């Protein structure tokens, strides 16, 4: 029954800086509190437990500090290493209930980069399968925020079509969104001219960019 | 320092049960008390339960009691997690995991909540849906939209199932400036994933390019040809 909330849902900062992050408790879990560090499709990473204590092997950077309802795992001169999405474990309720929190990415802020939109048509032989996907491309920006909109003949139509963004990256360190139109064939066939729009926060001005089939 | 190893992931279907093995080796096993920890895709760890295996005793979480069960086998040391009547939402990674109690075996034990030692994590997907290899289409590069430098292009594997699919281009090679997108669930039960490359358009006509979709579960290798069309 105990919640485990993570305030800090998204947390950007950069490289060397100083990294905090707050896990907050329903009722009081004492001490038995841990730390996790999970990098994207990796098993997590016991870092600290016992609230204030770190795992045998792991970088004195990372602090933990906190008791009772109220855990920081506040992080000194952040890493390279150190992305990864940081969640807090509370394992003090008996019998065995524990819980954790929702968690916390520790993604590397840098500069606000607008976002190239390739709008890729579907391939004919696509089409002969018997639907058709727009791919509308967003690549290498950063605040992951960049709200995308299909129009379909100057149609606000939104519904089929999905988004996915792609982790922070290694060089680079931005993000790569991906929205995608599937429609039929006969309403592919329906429409002239599909547009995809984004507004990114990086972006001067919305850039629509589209195409007519053929 | 123990290493712990899980049994392979396995696509179950709607109303069944899942059983997912975790070899644990490198130390004295009934020292160890070992814990299921599942992760939906996107979402974030949830408890699962813990064994207290020296005392063959399990505690389980409240919204899966009775669905779920923990048992281990010290004979051949392997931890085991049982999950029957599987919705879709089950769908996720379960990771074994354990943490090391004191001289158990001497009646010593610290009785640990957090896990020190996970396993690899062993992927579960629950669908209605049935297992069938991927279709790849190219995504003409953008020769309308983008030049003067380089222009993307790349491909749309689309409609595959169960998870995961691995991509590279030119036979393994542009495996640079390439951002493969994760996969997304359509409606239909089934995956769709895209991967691009943005490369240099004075570059098309001359090398071929090919992104290499692999499907192991289907068991179906696919390549396609993505010609500057």
């Known amino acids: 029954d105990i919640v485990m909330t993570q305030s800090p849902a998204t947390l950007s900062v950069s490289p060397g800086e100083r990294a905090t992050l707050s896990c907050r408790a329903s009722e009081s879990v004492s001490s038995d509190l841990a730390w996790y560090q999970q990098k994207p499709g990796q098993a997590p990473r016991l870092l600290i437990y016992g609230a204030s204590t770190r795992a045998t092997g792991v970088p004195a950077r990372f602090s933990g500090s906190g008791s009772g309802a109220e855990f920081t795992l506040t992080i000194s001169s952040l890493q390279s290493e150190d992305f990864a999405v940081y969640y807090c474990?509370?394992?003090?309720?008996?019998?065995?209930?524990?819980?954790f929190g929702q968690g916390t990415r520790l993604e590397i802020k840098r500069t606000v980069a607008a976002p190239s939109v390739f709008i890729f048509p579907p391939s004919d032989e696509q089409l002969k399968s018997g639907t058709a996907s727009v791919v509308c491309l967003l690549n290498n920006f950063y605040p992951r925020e960049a709200k995308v909109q299909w129009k379909v003949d100057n149609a606000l139509q939104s519904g089929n079509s999905q988004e996915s963004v792609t982790e922070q990256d290694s060089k680079d360190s931005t993000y790569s969104l991906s929205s995608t139109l599937t429609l039929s064939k006969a309403d592919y066939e329906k429409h002239k001219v599909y547009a995809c729009e984004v507004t990114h926060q990086g972006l001067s001005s919305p850039v629509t960019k589209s195409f007519n089939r053929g | 320092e123990v290493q712990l190893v899980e049994s392979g992931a396995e696509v179950k279907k709607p109303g069944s049960s899942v059983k997912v093995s975790c070899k644990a080796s490198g130390d004295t096993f009934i020292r160890y008390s070992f814990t299921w920890v599942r992760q939906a895709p996107g979402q974030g760890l949830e408890w699962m339960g813990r064994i207290i295996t020296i005392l063959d005793v399990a505690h389980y979480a409240p919204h899966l009691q009775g669905r779920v069960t923990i048992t281990a086998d010290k004979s051949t040391s392997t931890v085991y997690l049982e999950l029957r009547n599987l919705r879709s939402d089950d769908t996720a990674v379960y990771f074994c995991a354990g943490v090391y109690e004191g001289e158990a075996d001497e009646g010593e034990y610290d009785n640990n909540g957090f896990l020190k030692h996970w396993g690899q994590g062993t992927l579960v997907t629950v669908s209605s849906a049935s297992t069938k290899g991927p279709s790849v289409f190219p995504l003409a590069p953008s020769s309308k939209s983008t030049s003067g430098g380089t222009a993307a292009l790349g491909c749309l594997v689309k409609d595959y199932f169960p998870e995961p699919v691995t991509v590279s281009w030119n036979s393994g090679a542009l495996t640079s400036g390439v951002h493969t997108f994760p996969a997304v669930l359509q409606s239909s039960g089934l995956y769709s994933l895209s991967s691009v490359v943005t490369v240099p358009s004075s570059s098309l006509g001359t090398q071929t390019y090919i992104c290499n979709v692999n499907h192991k579960p289907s068991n179906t290798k696919v390549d396609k040809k993505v010609e500057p069309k």
């Open positions: 474990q509370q394992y003090n309720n008996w019998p065995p209930r524990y819980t």
